[PDB]
């Protein structure tokens, strides 16, 4: 019987998407550096939109490779799983950079502008009205998908859709609540050495979470065309849970500002 190598191939190097993403990044360069000092307001949004659209085109061709042409196997499954599980540990470093920047700004007191941190002029929010709901809504997000995973293993549809949709409609509510928190905040980006380290170590989650919502909207559009199945372990099936571990380490960020900071 005619056999083959398990790992697979793609379209060759004259391919429009690798030139597209690169010339797109040059357009993002010119946008970020010409609106900053010559002032073209329109096209930085155009660069962000074409970045999102080229990401969805690249993703659509690779999920066509995944299911519409049927290429991946168990070795490639373990490879993509291990690669984007080490991507978690790569994200831990850019996380810990801001974490250690705030750790240095709070452990070492600047003798000017409020030697005690939070400074004289900036007052932090009480962690009990909204953030006591935030830690519990993140805990529920991390607590019900581990039963939604057994629901997807078991083969039914309504229970898995129930746990899944309460999780992610709930985190759309979390998008709105974080938006109203960091809209209603008095001190701003331009304050202290406290403001845009705290707003940076919230806006990183804002960026990751709008990308997360885009990724699971395309995941649900993929789900409704009978693409994914409980035996269809193709490789995108396992790259959907690890953002809950990212939210557990987000809770690890969350704890250093409330119990130990103030």
């Amino acid at each position: 019987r005619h056999q083959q190598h398990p790992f697979h191939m793609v379209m060759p190097s004259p391919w429009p998407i690798v030139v597209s993403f690169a010339l797109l990044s040059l357009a993002l360069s010119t946008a970020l550096t010409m609106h900053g000092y010559i002032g073209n307001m329109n096209m930085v949004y155009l660069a962000l939109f074409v970045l999102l659209t080229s990401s969805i085109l690249w993703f659509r061709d690779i999920v066509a490779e995944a299911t519409y042409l049927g290429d991946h196997t168990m070795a490639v499954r373990k490879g993509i799983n291990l690669g984007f599980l080490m991507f978690v540990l790569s994200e831990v470093l850019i996380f810990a950079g801001l974490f250690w920047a705030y750790f240095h700004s709070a452990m070492s007191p600047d003798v000017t502008l409020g030697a005690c941190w939070p400074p004289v002029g900036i007052e932090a929010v009480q962690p009990t009205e909204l953030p006591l709901l935030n830690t519990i809504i993140l805990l529920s997000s991390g607590a019900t998908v581990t039963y939604s995973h057994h629901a997807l293993i078991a083969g039914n549809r309504n229970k898995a859709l129930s746990g899944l949709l309460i999780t992610f409609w709930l985190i759309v509510i979390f998008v709105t609540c974080q938006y109203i928190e960091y809209t209603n905040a008095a001190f701003t980006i331009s304050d202290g050495v406290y403001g845009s380290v705290f707003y940076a170590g919230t806006g990183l989650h804002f960026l990751h979470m709008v990308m997360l919502a885009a990724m699971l909207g395309v995941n649900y559009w993929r789900m409704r065309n009978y693409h994914l199945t409980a035996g269809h372990h193709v490789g995108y099936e396992t790259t959907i849970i690890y953002t809950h571990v990212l939210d557990v380490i987000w809770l690890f960020l969350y704890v250093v500002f409330y119990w130990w900071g103030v």
Binding site: L133, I137, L139, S140
Partner: peptide
């Protein structure tokens, strides 16, 4: 199942406070 349901009920009870 018991980690999801009753803990989510207590979560929705504690969310209605504030």
């Amino acid at each position: 199942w018991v980690a999801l349901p009753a803990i989510a009920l207590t979560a929705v009870n504690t969310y209605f406070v504030e």
